Structure formats: structure tokens, C-alpha cells
Design an enzyme around this catalytic site. Structure first.
Site, PDB file in Angstrom:
ATOM      1  CG  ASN A  91      40.032  36.512  47.085  1.00  0.00           C
ATOM      2  OD1 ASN A  91      40.333  35.325  46.921  1.00  0.00           O
ATOM      3  ND2 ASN A  91      40.242  37.135  48.242  1.00  0.00           N
ATOM      4  CG  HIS A  95      38.918  37.078  40.980  1.00  0.00           C
ATOM      5  ND1 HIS A  95      39.610  37.129  39.790  1.00  0.00           N
ATOM      6  CD2 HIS A  95      39.397  38.040  41.807  1.00  0.00           C
ATOM      7  CE1 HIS A  95      40.496  38.109  39.925  1.00  0.00           C
ATOM      8  NE2 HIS A  95      40.410  38.684  41.123  1.00  0.00           N
ATOM      9  CB  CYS A 133      33.694  34.944  33.074  1.00  0.00           C
ATOM     10  SG  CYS A 133      32.198  35.979  33.022  1.00  0.00           S
TER      11      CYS A 133
HETATM   12  N1  LIG Z   1      41.416  31.739  39.654  1.00  0.00           N
HETATM   13  S1  LIG Z   1      41.247  33.143  38.938  1.00  0.00           S
HETATM   14  O1  LIG Z   1      39.850  33.418  38.823  1.00  0.00           O
HETATM   15  O2  LIG Z   1      42.084  33.163  37.782  1.00  0.00           O
HETATM   16  C1  LIG Z   1      41.897  34.377  40.047  1.00  0.00           C
HETATM   17  N2  LIG Z   1      42.811  35.303  39.684  1.00  0.00           N
HETATM   18  C2  LIG Z   1      43.011  36.102  40.809  1.00  0.00           C
HETATM   19  C3  LIG Z   1      43.807  37.223  41.034  1.00  0.00           C
HETATM   20  C4  LIG Z   1      43.753  37.822  42.288  1.00  0.00           C
HETATM   21  C5  LIG Z   1      42.922  37.312  43.288  1.00  0.00           C
HETATM   22  C6  LIG Z   1      42.134  36.190  43.057  1.00  0.00           C
HETATM   23  C7  LIG Z   1      42.180  35.582  41.801  1.00  0.00           C
HETATM   24  N3  LIG Z   1      41.491  34.487  41.296  1.00  0.00           N
END
Ligand SMILES: NS(=O)(=O)c1nc2ccccc2[nH]1
Ligand SMILES: NS(=O)(=O)c1nc2ccccc2[nH]1
Ligand SMILES: NS(=O)(=O)c1nc2ccccc2[nH]1
Ligand SMILES: NS(=O)(=O)c1nc2ccccc2[nH]1
Ligand SMILES: NS(=O)(=O)c1nc2ccccc2[nH]1
Ligand SMILES: NS(=O)(=O)c1nc2ccccc2[nH]1
EC number: 3.1.2.14
Lengths: 264, 264
Positions: free
Chosen positions: A186, A188, A222
Site C-alpha cells: 500500500n 506505506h 514515517c
Molecule cells: N500502519 S500505518 O502505516 O499507520 C498505515 N496507515 C494506512 C492508511 C491507508 C493504507 C495503509 C496504511 N497503513
């Protein structure tokens, strides 16, 4: 891998790869953390997810890691087969917990254990929220109802409060930034990358110890264009450290954690 | 995995993992390169290597990659099983070549191919040398004697000469540095990390709209643990790019390469 007979947990075996091991020819803690993530994903797929429920996808809600706690007694060697069992438990309206047990496939002995706390967050605004009954009813049928804890013990290290590291830090690794291999599907930053960044501020001399315990609190992410500074101070036969990851510019905290190391 | 019936090649199957895929839910080229390295290691182990032979160990000699060439027609999806076949061939006194064939385990179709040129180097002085006769006789029994080429065709892209990128570069990613996860079990930077660093200077617009079809990389010098690298790219055209990795300070070349990208 496969769900167990009762359908309330999932097991999978992994052969440790040449590029997955460190100087001692055993799996790094980042390899272990990637395998925990992989067995968690395989468990969610086996029970019908793709781990967002139907109501969560409708409301643009996702599960995010608030804390991860891993304890390793023995790291599997290159070529060894490690078997990992995982399951989820509901923690009322607070969120969910995913636990893991790592075993040597040849001896059947427990070589490690891990636990993680997950919270519900809106994908778009990043606002946290309690678990509604509608969402809870959709995932409770996939969890054991009686307690099943990887870390039963009364005053165990998985639930301890972590303080904020005070400046000046004893050790530091500055200017850390993710590359495309650090991102998930995704786009991230993968949770395991943060463990790597925390470990970058541990001195190379600490060659003489094995990492036994790591507890990490996730506060902020990050982003792809962010730069991180990794800070460490010794707080202690065993060496203990207090850790802090913060953005290089404004000094905004992204993670805090602790590690415990035992002399080889 | 296992050696084939004649004992002159090795095959292994891999299930693509959740953290091994990019935004398209297919394996990254770095995941592919790690799997080629893993199947190469398993092949060397299966034929008795502790890929240094007895005479090489006595002389403090090792095999090092001079060039890597990978062509991918289809990247395997998350959960797909990819089967990889590898073998080695002697190239007279110049060195050795390791080739690979990637296949979809369900269809049996060839989804990719790779080739690599290896040279003999003294592990202490880093001086290159021709392969004697005693050393050749020790590993020729593990190679097919008749030619077996992953890239048979004439004037193939695997053997093309690569020029040196001229300043100013069109694109760049500066200040890249390895972390402990980038090192192999001998504490040297893993060859796959260099592929990641080359790809860091490709714009996100290209990655989002194209798929990487071909990558050729020439390895000239090592990035040490305390070194910092700059990644430079210029479009030479499908989209084709010329690449250069150099040390951030003195500008010493560590790698040069080319990539070819196909519109999605
Ligand atoms: N676990 S995170 O890095 O906070 C995170 N936020 C997100 C929002 C949308 C899609 C994937 C994500 N992963
Ligand atoms: N639990 S949280 O504080 O909302 C949170 N979890 C995270 C996991 C990875 C990156 C940022 C995160 N922020
Ligand atoms: N790995 S990353 O930090 O998400 C990233 N985004 C990028 C965009 C353009 C060029 C290189 C990049 N690397
Ligand atoms: N063939 S070479 O130019 O001696 C060489 N191969 C290498 C592989 C990885 C890193 C540095 C290298 N230097
Ligand atoms: N392939 S390399 O990174 O140039 C390299 N040189 C080495 C010397 C001693 C041990 C491992 C090595 N790996
Ligand atoms: N991954 S590395 O660049 O080899 C490295 N060496 C290190 C020595 C001390 C602290 C952090 C380090 N990271």
C-alpha cells in the site's frame, strides 16, 4: 500453512534463507518480524479476509499496530525450519491482540514468542476509535473466546510503560530514510523497517550480545519523504537500552521502545 | 529444492510473500534477485560446497559478481508459486557464469531469466585473477560440459557494453547508506541492495506507469559499511535509462547499469 483443527489458530513452517541471517548464521530479529507478519497475513486470508471486515471497508477503517513485543530464546539457523503458530483475541472496545509462538520444527521446543496490540483507525483522517459491536461480531467467530496469551505471567515485559528518552542521547544514527524495498504493497513504510531503524543506534560492539527482548510503541508514521533520527541510551550480564525514533527536522516522535541483550 | 536427475542443475519452488510484493501485488525485482541468490546458495550446498572449493579456501580466494542481467516477462503475484532452475558453466580462464530460468509453477511457462558473470578475487587484497587448472577441475564435475545458456540468442542484451553516465544526471537520489539488514552473513553489503539503490533514482511516475522488463548491472567496487552512495539516472530513449552509483564524497564509481521499462 493451515488453520488448526478447531479453526481458531494458524500454523506455518519456514526454512531460514541465506540472505535472512546475520554474522552468527542465525535469523535476524527483522527476519523474525517479517515471518510473524507473513503468518498473520496467511491466517487472515485463510478465514476469508482481504484483516479488514465488511463493515470496516465500508467505513474506511483499518487495523494499525500500536505496540509489538518479541522475546527470542534461540534464533533459528540458516537452513533450519521454524514453525510459527498465530491467533487473535478481542480486547473489548480497546482493540485486538495478535499473539505468536515460534518453535524449532525438529525438537518441538518453544524458541520464541511475540504479542502485538492493534487499534481501529480511519484510513483517511488517521483518527483512532473504539471497536463497535457490529465490527466486533464480524471477527469474534475467528478468535478463541477463553483467554489464550503468549505472555501469561503477571508482571511480564509486554505490557510495561516506556518513558521518553531525554536529550542528549548516549548513541545515535542520523539521517535514516526509507527506500522502495522498505514499503508495503500500500506504499506505506513496513512496520519491520522501524525495528531496523531502532537497532541502527545500538553500537556494533554490543558482536558480543544477542537480542533477547524488544518492545516497540508506534506513535506516528514515517512518510516516503521523511528522514528519521534513531537515538539510544543504556539504562542498565544483561544490557538494557531505551530507544527513540524522531523526525530529523522538527523532532516529532514516531516511535519509542526498549531492548534487552544477553552476553553470548 | 533439489538437484535434477543428472546432478548438473538445481530447482526450487518459492511461494511469494506479502512483504515481498510492490504496489501491483507482484514480486519486486529485489525479491526476484534475493530468490536467485537463495537458489544459487542451495545449489552450492547440495553439491558439497561449505561456492569456494578446497583449493580456493587454502588460497583465500572467493567468487565475486562482475555482472548481473535479469529479464522478467511476468512478475509472480502474492501467493503464487514460482519455480527456479539454476546451473553453472565454466568460461575458460575468465571465470564462471551462473544462469537461471524462472517459471510459473501452475502453467510451466517461462516468466523470466537471468545470467551472471563471476570472477576469482583474493578476499584480503581484492586482487582479481584468472582461474588456474586445479581450481577448474574441482568444479567442472558440477557443470554441464556442452553449452547451456539462459540467453542463447546472438547480440543479446546480457553481454552489451555499458557507458559511463555524464554529469549532469537527469535524476538523482543522494545520501544513500546501508543499514544492518542490507548486509550478508559476512558483513558485506548484499548485491541486491545495489539494485535497490540504482532504482532509487528512477522517478515514481515511471514506476507507477511502467513495469521493469530488463536490468543489467556491472559491479566495480564495494560500498563499505561506513560509505554513502549517490544514485544517478539519465533517460537514453519503452523507456530506457543509463545508471551510475558513486561514493558521495570523492565520486568514485561503484556500479554502472541500464534498465528497460515497458508501459503497463
Ligand atoms: N500502519 S500505518 O502505516 O499507520 C498505515 N496507515 C494506512 C492508511 C491507508 C493504507 C495503509 C496504511 N497503513
Ligand atoms: N497505534 S497508532 O499510534 O495509531 C500507529 N500505529 C502505527 C503503526 C505504524 C506507523 C504509525 C502508526 N501509528
Ligand atoms: N522508498 S520511498 O522513500 O517511498 C521513494 N519514493 C520515491 C519517489 C521518487 C524517487 C525515489 C523514491 N523513493
Ligand atoms: N568484479 S569486481 O569488479 O571485482 C566486484 N564485484 C563486486 C560485487 C559486489 C561489490 C563489489 C564488487 N566488485
Ligand atoms: N562480493 S564483495 O562484496 O566484493 C565481497 N568481498 C569479500 C571479501 C571477503 C568476504 C566476503 C566478501 N564479499
Ligand atoms: N549497516 S551498517 O552500515 O553496516 C552499520 N554498521 C554500524 C556500526 C555501528 C552502528 C550502526 C551501524 N550500521
Amino acid at each position: 500453512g493451515s488453520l488448526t483443527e478447531d479453526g481458531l489458530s494458524y500454523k506455518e513452517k519456514f526454512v531460514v534463507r541465506s540472505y535472512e541471517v546475520g554474522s552468527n548464521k542465525t535469523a535476524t530479529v527483522e527476519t523474525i518480524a517479517n515471518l510473524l507478519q507473513e503468518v498473520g497475513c496467511n491466517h487472515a486470508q485463510s478465514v476469508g479476509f482481504s484483516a479488514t471486515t465488511t463493515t470496516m471497508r465500508k467505513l474506511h477503517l483499518i487495523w494499525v499496530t500500536a505496540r509489538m513485543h518479541i522475546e527470542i530464546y534461540k534464533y533459528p539457523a540458516w537452513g533450519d525450519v521454524v514453525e510459527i503458530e498465530t491467533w487473535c483475541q478481542s480486547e473489548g472496545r480497546i482493540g485486538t491482540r495478535r499473539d505468536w509462538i515460534l518453535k524449532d520444527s525438529v525438537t518441538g521446543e518453544v524458541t520464541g514468542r511475540a504479542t502485538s496490540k492493534w487499534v481501529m483507525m480511519n484510513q483517511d483522517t488517521r483518527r483512532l476509535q473504539k471497536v463497535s459491536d457490529d465490527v466486533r461480531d464480524e471477527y469474534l467467530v475467528f478468535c478463541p473466546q477463553e483467554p489464550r496469551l503468549a505472555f501469561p505471567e503477571e508482571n511480564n515485559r509486554s505490557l510495561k510503560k516506556i518513558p521518553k528518552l531525554e536529550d542528549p542521547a548516549q548513541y545515535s544514527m542520523i539521517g535514516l530514510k526509507p527506500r522502495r524495498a522498505d514499503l508495503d504493497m500500500n506504499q506505506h513504510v513496513n512496520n519491520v523497517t522501524y525495528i531496523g531503524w531502532v537497532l541502527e543506534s545500538i553500537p556494533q560492539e554490543i558482536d558480543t550480545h544477542e537480542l533477547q527482548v524488544i518492545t516497540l510503541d508506534y506513535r506516528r508514521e514515517c512518510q516516503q519523504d521523511d528522514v528519521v533520527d534513531s537515538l539510544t541510551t543504556t539504562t542498565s550480564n544483561d544490557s538494557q537500552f531505551l530507544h527513540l525514533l524522531r523526525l530529523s527536522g522538527d523532532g516529532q516522535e514516531i516511535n519509542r521502545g526498549t531492548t534487552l541483550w544477553r552476553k553470548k
